[PDB]
């Protein structure tokens, strides 16, 4: 009935009715006509249609409760001094209780995220990365949680030096402002333009140099499918177009990332990150190693994202060549670490929305951010 204070009980056996808390309900923003949606607060049918999908929501919901208690619980302890790995750890081994993992039904969405300074994205150590958090790191936190493939994507950054603050500020604002200015009929583009507008208009010091905010431009929000970390469509965060429209019932991850390099990220270090093609079908395989390597990921992750240190845990061993294999064969893809120019510093802000008939849910919204 109560969380101890090192998180330990599933978000399922704190909520004995099996109905968990929504996120932060908004009122789809307006058009040119000012175009009011306080109609869909409680218009007869849009009422039904989310009544309908309520079981859906609710399942979000339990997989948000389970981001927002264990983000707590990391940012009373990440602190320099801790490797890579350790931290990981620490915020899975939690991560894995409170979500009550149970296979396919129940888990962890995607690998945890603590890219770097410079790189921005998909970073996270392999066994035998040495990596330690420094001081001056500016470190992303970005992993998700699950329920029945109701996916939580769901991130923030971490710093130890002040020195950022008005960085990661310009960032969060820009999220903020993305998440306010989607909406069902919003245009991709149209988010992509305002996230720079706001993220542009920050300039900060660092170090004695001075930088305006870049957002990395080939960087990205997605749309989030069952069990598909990136549905389809993906929201600009620049002058991007993209060429469609948000539509009703849709779950967004809206994410921004800003740079002081040249506000473009690339494939770099070692890769950490692997997930089967959604699109992919049944490949018969010969090859032992490989087949069975296959038959793990099927079973483990299904089209799930992972990394080696999850392939380590499940008692997996020499595997890389088999990985590689699948790789080739197009079977699986390979998800690098994505940064930035040397030097230069980056930080991200996440959320996960749900587009319901009568309101816009920022359903893993906290008292944090
Ligand atoms: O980060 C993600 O949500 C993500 C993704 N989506 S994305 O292509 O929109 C993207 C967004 C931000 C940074 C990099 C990729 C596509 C594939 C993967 C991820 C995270 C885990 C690894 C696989
Ligand atoms: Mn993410
Ligand atoms: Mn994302």
């Not at 469509?233 to 990332?257: C, H, L, N, S």
Request: a negative charge.
């Amino acid at each position: 009935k109560v969380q101890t204070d090192p998180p330990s009980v599933p978000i399922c056996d704190l909520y004995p009715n099996g109905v968990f808390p929504k996120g932060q309900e908004c009122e789809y923003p307006p058009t040119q006509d000012g175009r009011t949606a306080a109609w869909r607060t409680t218009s007869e049918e849009k009422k039904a249609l989310d009544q309908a999908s309520e079981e859906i929501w609710n399942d979000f919901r339990e997989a948000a409760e389970a981001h927002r208690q264990v983000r707590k619980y990391v940012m009373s302890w990440i602190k320099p001094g801790m490797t890579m790995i350790e931290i990981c750890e620490k915020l899975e081994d939690c991560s894995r209780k409170l979500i009550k993992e149970n296979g396919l039904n129940a888990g962890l969405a995607f690998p945890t995220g603590c890219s770097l300074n410079n790189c921005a994205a998909h970073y996270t150590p392999n066994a035998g990365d040495t990596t330690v958090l420094q001081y001056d790191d500016i470190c992303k936190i970005d992993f998700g949680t699950h329920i029945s493939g109701r996916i939580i994507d769901c991130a923030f950054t971490v710093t130890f030096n002040p020195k950022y603050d008005t960085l990661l500020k310009a960032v969060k604002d820009a999220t903020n402002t993305g998440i306010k200015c989607a909406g069902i009929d919003v245009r991709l583009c149209d988010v992509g333009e305002a996230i720079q507008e706001v993220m542009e208009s920050y300039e900060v010091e660092i170090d004695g140099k001075t930088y305006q905010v870049k957002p990395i431009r080939n960087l990205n929000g997605h749309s989030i499918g069952q069990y598909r970390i990136h549905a389809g469509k993906t929201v600009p965060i620049i002058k991007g177009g993209e060429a469609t429209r948000m539509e009703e019932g849709e779950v967004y991850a809206i994410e921004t990332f800003g740079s002081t390099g040249k506000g473009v990220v690339h494939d770099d270090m070692e890769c950490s990150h692997y997930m089967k093609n959604f699109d992919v079908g049944h490949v018969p395989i010969r090859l032992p190693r490989t087949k069975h390597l296959l038959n793990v990921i099927n079973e483990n992750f299904g089209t799930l994202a992972f990394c080696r240190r999850w392939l380590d845990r499940l008692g997996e061993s020499k595997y890389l060549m088999a990985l590689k294999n699948l790789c080739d064969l197009g079977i699986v893809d390979p998800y690098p670490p994505l940064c930035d120019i040397k030097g230069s510093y980056t930080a991200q802000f996440e959320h996960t929305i749900l587009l319901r008939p009568t309101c816009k849910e920022v359903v893993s919204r906290g008292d944090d951010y």
